[PDB]
Design an enzyme around this catalytic site. Structure first.
Site, PDB file in Angstrom:
ATOM      1  N   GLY A 122       0.839  -1.177   0.000  1.00 35.13           N
ATOM      2  CA  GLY A 122       0.000   0.000   0.000  1.00 35.13           C
ATOM      3  C   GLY A 122       0.875   1.228   0.000  1.00 35.13           C
ATOM      4  O   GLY A 122       0.542   2.239  -0.623  1.00 35.13           O
ATOM      5  N   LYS A 243      -3.230   0.709 -19.000  1.00 34.99           N
ATOM      6  CA  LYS A 243      -4.048   0.870 -17.815  1.00 34.99           C
ATOM      7  C   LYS A 243      -5.512   0.817 -18.233  1.00 34.99           C
ATOM      8  O   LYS A 243      -5.897   1.393 -19.250  1.00 34.99           O
ATOM      9  CB  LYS A 243      -3.731   2.215 -17.165  1.00 34.99           C
ATOM     10  CG  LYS A 243      -4.084   2.287 -15.691  1.00 34.99           C
ATOM     11  CD  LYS A 243      -3.297   3.387 -14.978  1.00 34.99           C
ATOM     12  CE  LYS A 243      -3.643   3.457 -13.492  1.00 34.99           C
ATOM     13  NZ  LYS A 243      -2.631   4.267 -12.702  1.00 34.99           N
ATOM     14  N   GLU A 365      19.216   1.477   4.303  1.00 39.57           N
ATOM     15  CA  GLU A 365      18.460   1.113   5.497  1.00 39.57           C
ATOM     16  C   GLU A 365      17.028   0.718   5.160  1.00 39.57           C
ATOM     17  O   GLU A 365      16.456  -0.169   5.812  1.00 39.57           O
ATOM     18  CB  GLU A 365      18.460   2.272   6.490  1.00 39.57           C
ATOM     19  CG  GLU A 365      19.829   2.642   7.049  1.00 39.57           C
ATOM     20  CD  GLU A 365      20.688   3.439   6.088  1.00 39.57           C
ATOM     21  OE1 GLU A 365      20.168   3.970   5.086  1.00 39.57           O
ATOM     22  OE2 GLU A 365      21.897   3.552   6.357  1.00 39.57           O
ATOM     23  N   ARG A 473      27.146   4.651  22.674  1.00 36.52           N
ATOM     24  CA  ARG A 473      28.567   4.606  22.342  1.00 36.52           C
ATOM     25  C   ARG A 473      29.503   4.594  23.555  1.00 36.52           C
ATOM     26  O   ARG A 473      30.486   3.834  23.554  1.00 36.52           O
ATOM     27  CB  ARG A 473      28.914   5.760  21.396  1.00 36.52           C
ATOM     28  CG  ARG A 473      30.297   5.655  20.795  1.00 36.52           C
ATOM     29  CD  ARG A 473      30.556   6.835  19.886  1.00 36.52           C
ATOM     30  NE  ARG A 473      31.835   6.735  19.199  1.00 36.52           N
ATOM     31  CZ  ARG A 473      32.954   7.299  19.627  1.00 36.52           C
ATOM     32  NH1 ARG A 473      32.989   8.000  20.748  1.00 36.52           N
ATOM     33  NH2 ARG A 473      34.067   7.154  18.913  1.00 36.52           N
TER      34      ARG A 473
HETATM   35  C1  TPP Z   1      22.391   7.009   5.799  1.00 36.14           C
HETATM   36  C2  TPP Z   1      23.679   6.618   6.454  1.00 36.14           C
HETATM   37  N1  TPP Z   1      23.852   5.321   6.764  1.00 36.14           N
HETATM   38  C3  TPP Z   1      25.019   5.001   7.346  1.00 36.14           C
HETATM   39  C4  TPP Z   1      26.008   5.914   7.649  1.00 36.14           C
HETATM   40  C5  TPP Z   1      27.298   5.495   8.325  1.00 36.14           C
HETATM   41  N2  TPP Z   1      28.494   5.809   7.508  1.00 36.14           N
HETATM   42  C6  TPP Z   1      29.159   6.956   7.565  1.00 36.14           C
HETATM   43  S1  TPP Z   1      30.413   7.026   6.452  1.00 36.14           S
HETATM   44  C7  TPP Z   1      30.024   5.434   5.898  1.00 36.14           C
HETATM   45  C8  TPP Z   1      30.796   4.842   4.764  1.00 36.14           C
HETATM   46  C9  TPP Z   1      30.867   5.806   3.608  1.00 36.14           C
HETATM   47  O1  TPP Z   1      31.392   5.131   2.449  1.00 36.14           O
HETATM   48  P1  TPP Z   1      31.548   5.836   1.060  1.00 36.14           P
HETATM   49  O2  TPP Z   1      30.245   6.507   0.649  1.00 36.14           O
HETATM   50  O3  TPP Z   1      32.121   4.817   0.155  1.00 36.14           O
HETATM   51  O4  TPP Z   1      32.599   6.977   1.377  1.00 36.14           O
HETATM   52  P2  TPP Z   1      34.179   7.140   1.508  1.00 36.14           P
HETATM   53  O5  TPP Z   1      34.490   7.492   2.924  1.00 36.14           O
HETATM   54  O6  TPP Z   1      34.735   5.795   1.099  1.00 36.14           O
HETATM   55  O7  TPP Z   1      34.512   8.202   0.473  1.00 36.14           O
HETATM   56  C10 TPP Z   1      28.958   4.935   6.531  1.00 36.14           C
HETATM   57  C11 TPP Z   1      28.318   3.602   6.342  1.00 36.14           C
HETATM   58  C12 TPP Z   1      25.723   7.266   7.273  1.00 36.14           C
HETATM   59  N3  TPP Z   1      26.577   8.266   7.513  1.00 36.14           N
HETATM   60  N4  TPP Z   1      24.560   7.595   6.679  1.00 36.14           N
HETATM   61  C1  TPP Z   2       4.973   5.659  -1.103  1.00 32.70           C
HETATM   62  C2  TPP Z   2       3.679   6.054  -1.742  1.00 32.70           C
HETATM   63  N1  TPP Z   2       3.587   7.298  -2.247  1.00 32.70           N
HETATM   64  C3  TPP Z   2       2.415   7.621  -2.818  1.00 32.70           C
HETATM   65  C4  TPP Z   2       1.331   6.771  -2.894  1.00 32.70           C
HETATM   66  C5  TPP Z   2       0.027   7.199  -3.535  1.00 32.70           C
HETATM   67  N2  TPP Z   2      -0.348   6.341  -4.685  1.00 32.70           N
HETATM   68  C6  TPP Z   2      -1.077   5.237  -4.586  1.00 32.70           C
HETATM   69  S1  TPP Z   2      -1.252   4.451  -6.060  1.00 32.70           S
HETATM   70  C7  TPP Z   2      -0.307   5.675  -6.836  1.00 32.70           C
HETATM   71  C8  TPP Z   2       0.003   5.550  -8.292  1.00 32.70           C
HETATM   72  C9  TPP Z   2       0.545   4.180  -8.606  1.00 32.70           C
HETATM   73  O1  TPP Z   2       1.065   4.163  -9.949  1.00 32.70           O
HETATM   74  P1  TPP Z   2       1.750   2.901 -10.572  1.00 32.70           P
HETATM   75  O2  TPP Z   2       2.840   2.371  -9.652  1.00 32.70           O
HETATM   76  O3  TPP Z   2       2.129   3.289 -11.948  1.00 32.70           O
HETATM   77  O4  TPP Z   2       0.570   1.846 -10.580  1.00 32.70           O
HETATM   78  P2  TPP Z   2      -0.687   1.469 -11.484  1.00 32.70           P
HETATM   79  O5  TPP Z   2      -1.922   1.729 -10.689  1.00 32.70           O
HETATM   80  O6  TPP Z   2      -0.567   2.366 -12.695  1.00 32.70           O
HETATM   81  O7  TPP Z   2      -0.433   0.018 -11.857  1.00 32.70           O
HETATM   82  C10 TPP Z   2       0.131   6.590  -5.965  1.00 32.70           C
HETATM   83  C11 TPP Z   2       0.965   7.795  -6.241  1.00 32.70           C
HETATM   84  C12 TPP Z   2       1.538   5.470  -2.330  1.00 32.70           C
HETATM   85  N3  TPP Z   2       0.577   4.541  -2.314  1.00 32.70           N
HETATM   86  N4  TPP Z   2       2.712   5.134  -1.764  1.00 32.70           N
HETATM   87  O1  PO3 Z   3      32.443   3.550  15.829  1.00 32.41           O
HETATM   88  P1  PO3 Z   3      32.782   5.022  15.882  1.00 32.41           P
HETATM   89  O2  PO3 Z   3      31.681   5.818  16.555  1.00 32.41           O
HETATM   90  O3  PO3 Z   3      34.065   5.174  16.668  1.00 32.41           O
HETATM   91 CA    CA Z   4       1.268   2.712 -13.830  1.00 33.09          CA
END
Ligand code: TPP
Ligand code: TPP
Ligand code: PO3
Ligand code: CA
Ligand code: PO3
Ligand code: CA
Lengths: 620, 620
Positions: A122, A243, A365, A473
């Site tokens: 949904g 559709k 995530e 931590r």
């Molecule tokens: C959304 C999110 N998830 C996890 C982290 C934890 N984190 C910080 S730096 C890192 C690794 C970054 O790797 P990359 O993008 O390859 O950068 P680099 O340092 O190698 O240039 C992670 C997992 C974060 N900062 N943000």
């Molecule tokens: C994360 C999210 N954002 C917005 C909506 C609102 N919404 C429900 S159905 C829809 C359109 C779906 O389009 P598509 O994936 O092309 O499916 P179709 O009905 O054309 O097969 C939207 C924007 C939702 N359900 N979930």
């Molecule tokens: O694991 P980082 O917070 O030292």
């Molecule tokens: Ca569609």
């Protein structure tokens, strides 16, 4: 087994089935006065071929562990899912007309109160991640022959979570997974960005490692053939559809998403479709090969008591990793997932000891939570996901939908609060208690030392719903004897006297700040009762009130979290109205900044000195 | 202007600059005892070429509206960002050594208290979306010559939000946007999935519509050339680099992410790098062409009072669309964003009247919030985003980071609560008040009729921070005269008598249920005071308390939201401890289900009959 190449009569039966599915989707949504018949109609041939040619499942036992899995990622097409389960003989045909009624379980989007639904959908863009968890489980944990099929819309492919799942499936070689893309050109309020540029969809899927096949999505023959060839990669069936297919005057038109046909129009349209059906005889579902293993359902117990010594120093994040690895030696059902943070959450300890049950999800995530949800379906595994608690905010919609899915997953978020120090606010979880408390099925553990952390891991493993463990931590002292009994909803009084003047409630780092504040106050002949809640949800309301009544009715809460939705608000809501009871709150009042842990606890008013000053103010 | 093809001396100066940047990153993180020098080192040539050859900006005025924009999406590389601003002459060189200190503003990740930072990063995968907002503004709103550069890591490319931004930039032909991918092979705890398979990165970027160029990321010459060719598409510079480049024994090694060099090692390594620098002379930044337009900063006022008639029926979602379109006629600064839901949120009304200022973001809520954040930087626009409130949970981390970015964005979430009826829980917002209340800079509006909705839109436009307006699907009566004055933090008593026995606080649909409950109770000679909070955050604590003291101290809250983090908890936290004051709560206690709006309000205990029964219980 060999592909059974369908004859013309079987192909015609599949066409007749698809048209019956259209009729039922129209009938049900017209009766309800709401729903999405044009979204069902583009998928009718796909659904007929999946359920009555390709898939293997027990029609009278949809949850059977040997069945192929089907995930309707475009959940607003629920009426056609209900229709196929009536066509297969599981659902009574008359019940389809009760769609969306409060007296029915055929709700507007699929939900697991339906035996044929594993995950609620949904919220678009989440089904494929759940399907990846199911397929990973089938290939690597169950080691069974079942396959996993996931139907997505084209507008839905704008969600980044879909592309996280695409990348996951190719990293992990999920050749038992098939995604079907219903490329019907249109979204809700405009055409989907790529419309019918099928080659672009193919290029995107191939670039993410999938074997991609473009088909005419209204050709039962092309669909049978495309589903009938297994691959060594996850396979994307890119189906060009319209559709509202089969609805004269509505097919391929805008302004019809989520609009039922009026009664007079439904009657006319249904008569047209019915005239296309050559025979009333239904196709029977084909049962699966029964090679999924048995899974025990017993309680999971730690192999021994915690081995920490009172006075030793350990960060709860490290105790989490030690406790999860320990729990993995007790039950093969425990699996661990982490988002490229295993060195910092300490889930690397589990990976070292139980590598076959660790899933690296990378920096994604949303997908990680969906993987866990999929792995937990049909109770095949008991998953623990971990990252920094702050980054669980990235997956809030997946967690929200996990509760609608009645999912049993365990989440451990580390690095909570300002006490992480120098990284600054982007890494500080200050809203995670608010977020997880708002999740209906959640239990929220906030262990204050290594012993409580180990007990929380054990309790969480045996607790249904969305379990969250908040880890920290900094290294704090062990305060509990390792034979201390812990239970969900049971708090602990860690310091008390007969002349206590306020009950101070802290958790994690602020529990240890409260104990240090009690030592500062001892010099001034001021005694305070210190209470460790253990679970923030549910709260031990009885022990909190009995403590308060023993300390002149005064409660002070102190937490490394924002003011809204945290420990202080939980306590206030629990005790408001109780005579003579007052609650005072210390929390973090604004976005923090970089500094040493102790400097930030002082700057944001939640350290031992702030607690002592608040206690003195309450007495005077 | 013409590309200036650098001579060998300029190329050597750029190499010397990159090596100075390495030294500063090592010096600062070793002094701090924390940080990410190996992540800075892979980007050193990229940063040198961007800041001292490619970009055009005022070195003494980083926030100048004519400057090229740079977004450090891999925010943990902050020390090298600080180093370039010292090299450019804006930051004092000595201040770099104060990285991460509580006495410094050079925090662990970039934050907008720094003049050279527009958006906070640190949560990976969000910078490119902000950069898309900046580039969309530059091309379509400012219509200026500035360009936008965004540096991403390779592990970061696992985040789905990145791919939403990629798709957005090609849909909207952001040929003023350049993404630089630092493909240094490694993430935090393992190699990134694709490692140095540069061809796969190229295929993924090309499949999403970008012009993709693979370069040696440590060749200043290849970087100058690749940046020096403008394109008709957003351009991805895919830079093959080594993590820890230039650090002997650490380059290309695991176990070094986020690990500073110890003092003894830093000294040795710095001496090695310093021996590579041929000259101490610094390159000067080059200023931009000054063609960004002036933007007014005055208050935005609706052109007239609301035109609703007391007694008319309108859903607040429709009043939102009408009010936003009305506000767009008053100020060219208003822009509207929506995620393929404009027909249901009614932002389509704005699109019809002001199409050039509407941005269709498709089904991609994370990117939509990041776009708005980018559009609001440097106060260039005043953005209003809309979708169903439930789907803002998909963007919680973007909203959280928006508050760390001190961003002024406005969000309107429709379809709140069970009162939407038949779609069921996947579409019902029941945790949005919890979520938005936990955002530090937030103001939360919950208008109960069309007049309040129009006033909330006007107030939100003129309020700093993260503004949220919660709108509803059902049509309710207009209850306010259209000349009623509304203010943030000011509630309204909509029904009162001298013999009121409880103050009932409702909002949206539950305010109208409370008024209906008051009519049921009038038959039994029971009078209740009904209070409409208008803003849930901040709460009108004074009016709530004065109402309570007039009604025997009794407060009843009723809300179409879960129990945790909502109106009831906000009220309880505000009044706990006040003598004689009691609070009783009605809310939704579990995941709902499909049914008619009135049936669900009854099933979940928040309709007029539930309110009346609770009132009677409080009196007895
Ligand atoms: C959304 C999110 N998830 C996890 C982290 C934890 N984190 C910080 S730096 C890192 C690794 C970054 O790797 P990359 O993008 O390859 O950068 P680099 O340092 O190698 O240039 C992670 C997992 C974060 N900062 N943000
Ligand atoms: C994360 C999210 N954002 C917005 C909506 C609102 N919404 C429900 S159905 C829809 C359109 C779906 O389009 P598509 O994936 O092309 O499916 P179709 O009905 O054309 O097969 C939207 C924007 C939702 N359900 N979930
Ligand atoms: O694991 P980082 O917070 O030292
Ligand atoms: Ca569609
Ligand atoms: O816009 P939909 O909820 O009828
Ligand atoms: Ca990297």
């Amino acid at each position: 087994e060999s592909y059974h190449k369908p004859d013309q009569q079987k192909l015609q039966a599949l066409k007749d089935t698809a048209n019956r599915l259209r009729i039922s989707s129209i009938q049900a949504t017209t009766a309800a006065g709401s729903g999405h018949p044009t979204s069902c109609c583009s998928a009718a041939e796909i659904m007929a071929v999946l359920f009555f040619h390709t898939m293997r499942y027990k029609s009278q036992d949809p949850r059977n562990p040997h069945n192929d899995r089907f995930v309707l990622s475009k959940g607003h097409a629920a009426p056609i899912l209900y229709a196929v389960w009536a066509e297969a003989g599981f659902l009574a045909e008359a019940e389809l007309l009760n769609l969306r009624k409060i007296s029915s379980d055929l709700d507007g989007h699929p939900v697991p109160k339906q035996a044929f639904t594993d995950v609620a959908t949904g919220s678009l863009g989440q089904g494929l991640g759940a399907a990846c968890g199911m397929a990973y489980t089938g290939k690597y944990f169950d080691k069974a022959s079942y396959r996993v099929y996931c139907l997505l819309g084209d507008g839905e492919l704008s969600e980044g979570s879909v592309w996280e799942a695409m990348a996951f499936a190719s990293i992990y070689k999920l050749d038992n997974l098939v995604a079907i893309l219903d490329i019907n050109r249109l979204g809700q309020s405009d055409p989907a960005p790529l419309q019918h540029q099928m080659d672009i969809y193919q290029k995107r899927c191939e670039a993410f490692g999938w074997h991609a096949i473009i088909v005419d999505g209204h050709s039962v023959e092309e669909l049978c053939k495309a589903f009938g060839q297994a691959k060594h990669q996850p396979t994307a069936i890119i189906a060009k559809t319209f559709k509202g297919r089969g609805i004269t005057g509505v097919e391929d038109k805008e302004s019809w998403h989520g609009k039922p046909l009026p009664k007079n129009m439904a009657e006319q349209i249904i008569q047209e479709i019915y005239s296309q059906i050559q025979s009333k005889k239904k196709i029977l579902a084909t049962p699966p090969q029964e090679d999924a293993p048995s899974v025990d359902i017993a309680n999971i117990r730690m192999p021994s008591l915690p081995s920490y010594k009172v006075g030793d120093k350990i960060a709860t994040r490290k105790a989490y990793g030690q406790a999860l690895a320990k729990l993995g030696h007790a039950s093969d059902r425990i699996i661990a997932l982490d988002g490229d943070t295993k060195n910092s959450t300490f889930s690397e300890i589990f990976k070292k000891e139980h590598p076959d049950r660790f899933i690296e999800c990378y920096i994604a995530e949303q997908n990680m939570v969906s993987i866990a949800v999929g792995c937990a379906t049909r109770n095949r595994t008991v998953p623990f996901c971990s990252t920094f608690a702050a980054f669980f905010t990235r997956a809030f919609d997946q967690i929200r939908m996990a509760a609608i899915s009645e999912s049993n997953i365990n989440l451990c978020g580390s690095h909570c609060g300002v006490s992480i120090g120098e990284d600054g606010p982007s890494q500080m979880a200050l809203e995670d208690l608010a977020m997880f408390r708002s999740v209906p099925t959640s239990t929220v553990f906030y262990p204050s030392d290594g012993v409580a952390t180990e007990k929380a891991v054990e309790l969480a493993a045996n607790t249904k719903g969305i379990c969250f463990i908040r880890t920290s931590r900094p290294e704090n002292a062990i305060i509990y004897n390792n034979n201390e009994d812990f239970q969900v909803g049971q708090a602990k009084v860690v310091l008390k006297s007969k002349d206590d003047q306020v009950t101070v409630i802290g958790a994690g780092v602020t529990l240890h700040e409260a104990l240090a504040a009690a030592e500062l106050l001892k010099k001034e002949k001021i005694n305070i009762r210190v209470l460790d809640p253990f679970t923030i949800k549910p709260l031990d309301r009885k022990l909190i009130l009995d403590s308060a009544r023993a300390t002149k009715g005064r409660i002070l809460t102190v937490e490394d979290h924002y003011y809204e939705g945290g420990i202080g608000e939980a306590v206030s809501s629990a005790v408001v109205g109780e005579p003579g009871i007052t609650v005072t709150h210390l929390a973090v009042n604004r976005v923090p900044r970089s500094g040493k842990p102790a400097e930030l606890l002082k700057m944001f008013g939640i350290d031992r000195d702030a607690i002592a000053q608040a206690v003195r103010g309450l007495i005077t």
